[model samples]
Target: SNNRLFVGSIPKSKTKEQILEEFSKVTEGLTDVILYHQPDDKKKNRGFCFLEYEDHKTAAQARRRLMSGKVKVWGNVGTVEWADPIEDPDMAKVKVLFVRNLANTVTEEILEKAFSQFGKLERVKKLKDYAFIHFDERDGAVKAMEEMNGKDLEGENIEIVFAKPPD
Candidate 1:
């Protein structure tokens, strides 16, 4: 019954139109395609997008055909995966995630500056060992995860993970 599918690992060179063209070949009945991109740096592909199909059947078919496959663009191969939308209403309100393991001297300004390149951040909170980030949308979160996960930040290999509100 879920018609929303999160597509990830898109190549940086692939444009939104190109992504749509590729997926359109495999499935019909698509309603919307949203590509998450960095607000500041336009050249780097955040590597994720959300697609909505008119029916669950089409979405399922697309999943079967495209999940874990390679989407090539500009001679570079990128991996793809289908993600389910996070269904919790409370967590849905979360626009950003505060990251941790930054250098001891890192400041809120530094963190904000780093992530602002990705998107418009709602807020940035500095914790003892981590920072909190609230992005404008789920797509921003998806973008951050795609671009920042396993990437080093200020001498630390940062790990990006979703944190849902406590039940």
Candidate 2:
């Protein structure tokens, strides 16, 4: 079934448990909720992820009930959508590169501003010391690799590499 759903514009402060808990309040029969995260980064909050339900009925229900609903996280309202998931695991595994040498006070918005030029970013994780950028497509990853890799940030050379999935 081509019934995969996409949840969009999620707040960076919302955790996987929080998202599932909120959704569970309005929908039923959720099979699983996978909140993708960078393996090594803990402080960054990328604003989008995929969700899978046990059945299409649940997904459709979510789309109908939760889309555009206000999920107040980090003092902001987030958007949600329903769409097909990326088919290729390799494509889905597109690497998240960490930008180094950022200011001691660097934010995700700063990282997002720098990387937005590449393409539609999947999410931006702002850390006190670094950032993890998730691009929407493989082409975006290639562009980042070509242009941003090895570039100097603040005072350090940025590093680009495949980030492992959350354990």
Candidate 3:
């Protein structure tokens, strides 16, 4: 009941009532259409919207229908994703870093060697041009990001950010 869905790509010309009516057709339990307007004009939508549903299940289904291309809003399918996703209680102290833009020759062993220099590592995995470095503690992960992020790895400068939890 507390779930809110993020709906994007809405036409500026669309009205809140029209959007509410349109969205209600595909899923039930929709309680509100939360849309914003431009600062100067109350009549023009900024194309961002949130839909409040009675329950998480209904909201999730609505997002899925829109995301899977089985539903459309005003003849155009837009972006739909969970505005309120599951949050880990310990997310405040994440230990994994998402590293991207890796060189082709980069390997798990290499990443382990490089990141482990900062702190004790739980794991390091390289997939495609990205890698996930898991440190035993948040301090090490933060230090590794500060030290290695944007630094050259083999040939390319790697990018690093806290890895988001899987949906």
Candidate 4:
């Protein structure tokens, strides 16, 4: 409760022990490290961590010095920020989404013409009955999913959902 830090996006190559070694160098009362994993694979973590410290004041001290500062996992950059008082980020909000019940006539140009009004399209893939749409960031996907999910295209109503994670 008194001391904690959330670290984000550690390089895939860096292990927990190596990071713990470097992190312990700057502070005292280091109590524990809990690393969260990528939801799809048990072995891989997208590099999110919770660091506990024994000293209350030292926790805030580290947060200010290191928030968003890059760390080296031997040439990789790892970032740390405050997480105890605030919850961690949800990464899923910004990826590919699936559209179902798509008419066979749907084309890449058709999706670009329509979805582009609400968000920047990273890429749109079309198929007879389904399509995959990618966005530059979370808000576009959120807007498209929220405002445009069950809407019509070519006089045909369609369905949409975030694609399930790839295992």
Local accuracy of candidate 1 as per-residue lDDT tens digits, 1-73: 5776776556756777787777776667777777767777885568777777888888777666564344333
- Number of clashing pairs per prediction, in order: 8, 4, 2, 0
How far out, in Å, is residue 81 in model 3? 0.8
**What lDDT would each prediction earn against the true structure?**
0.70, 0.65, 0.82, 0.71
Off by over 4 Å in 1: 1-93
Residue 128 error, candidate 2, Å: 62
By TM-score, is 1 or 4 better? 1
| Residue-level lDDT for 167 in candidate 3 | 50
Candidate 2 global CA lDDT score = 0.65
Clash-forming residue pairs, model 4: none
Off by over 4 Å in 3: 84-167
TM-score of each predicted structure versus truth: 0.46, 0.42, 0.49, 0.44
Candidate 1 structure lDDT: 0.70
Clashes of 2: 4
* Tens-digit lDDT string for candidate 4 (47-129): 66777777667777776656534433333245566664314443345467788887768888988888887778889998777
Best-to-worst lDDT order? 3, 4, 1, 2
**Quick one: ranking by TM-score, best first?**
3, 1, 4, 2
Q: Model 1: which ten-residue window has the lowest total lDDT?
A: 71-80
